[PDB]
Amino acid sequence: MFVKQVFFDLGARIHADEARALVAKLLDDTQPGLVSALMNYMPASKTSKTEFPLVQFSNFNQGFALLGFGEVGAQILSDATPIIHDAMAKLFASRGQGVVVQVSSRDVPLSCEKRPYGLQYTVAKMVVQKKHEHRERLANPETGKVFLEGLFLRSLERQAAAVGMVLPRDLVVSFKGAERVSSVKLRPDSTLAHGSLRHAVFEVNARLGGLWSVGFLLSKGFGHINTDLQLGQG
DNA sequence: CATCAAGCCTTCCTTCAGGTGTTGCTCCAGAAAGGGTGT
Known part of the structure; x- marks a missing residue:
């Protein structure tokens, strides 16, 4: 069908696995279903699924990118993008002068x-x-x-x-x-x-x-x- | 060579003419008496 690709511009490049660990550490205290959606965990435990994971991190020159495969992955990215962007905004407005987080979205x-x-x-x-x-x-x-x-x-x-x-x-x-x-x-x-x-x-x-x-x-x-x-x- | 843009608003009828004159029926629906004249 179609896949979705969402880019987060931060002004500085962070790697895909490091951004995965960062959004794992940051959104952990609240909303457990959402991180269970994005890291494709089991519905009961912390272990990730053995099947094909629908949402995966990718490479972005100015930040990190997210890929949602199929309608389910597109819906998960759609419900998760403002929360991720707000978490990045609060994290990088806590320290320093503060940056503005830009976004981009594609349906390929x-x-x-x-x-x-x-x-x-x-x-x-x-x-x-x-x-x-x-x-x-x-x-x-x-x-x-x-x-x-x-x-x-x-x-x-x-x-x-x-x-x-x-x-x-x-x-x-x-x-x-x-x-x-x-x-x-x-x-x-x-x-x-x-x-x-x-x-x-x-x-x-x-x-x-x-x-x-x-x-x-x-x-x-x-x-x-x-x-x-x-x-x-x- | 792939998406992203893949309109938005609001207008979205107004007055008035919106009939006048005429026509607006006619006629006959009988049979005999008393004359001719034509066969």
Whole structure:
């Protein structure tokens, strides 16, 4: 269907996971249903859901951005945007002279069509490592290429099934090249880290017409980009 | 190459002419007596 993208301009850049932790710390004392909505927690406990999370943080040059997938995620972002903006306004009016928080909002539709020619898509800061078995797959390129193939195809199928639209099942993807390999730490000052890929390029015969999220740690702000900017790039 | 804009208000009829003159029926609905004249 359609997804929603809300940008919060603050005047200074804060990272997606840091903004996630900041709105977790700030709105915690009051309104527990709303933070249970935005961090996609279980209705009874603090543990997040194992399914596809509808609302995820993203990257903004002057602040942070929020993505609500589908009608439910769009409604959650719609009921949560003024409370988040008021919390940011009070937090940054408590200290200093005080800044003005600007907003932006977009409703990007989702579409996909199969074409008989390959198409190029570059994904920045995608997490692909979670276990030791994937590390054993990563050492050899032949058994790692098929792993990236299946990961990209399953991420596309999971997002298409989560948003509620049908995807053709004859898609042939291919993975060409990589630029860098780095690490991602969920919590600062922790020994544990997950391997991640920087500037991967992929080739799929079909075309995409919106924000598409691939890989792991999608909620934290990893492995997503707009295909609308990348088709006809400029 | 994708959205975001994807109007808003208020006007939203007014007076007046809004008939005049005529026409506004006519006629006949019988049969015999007493003359001709034409066959």
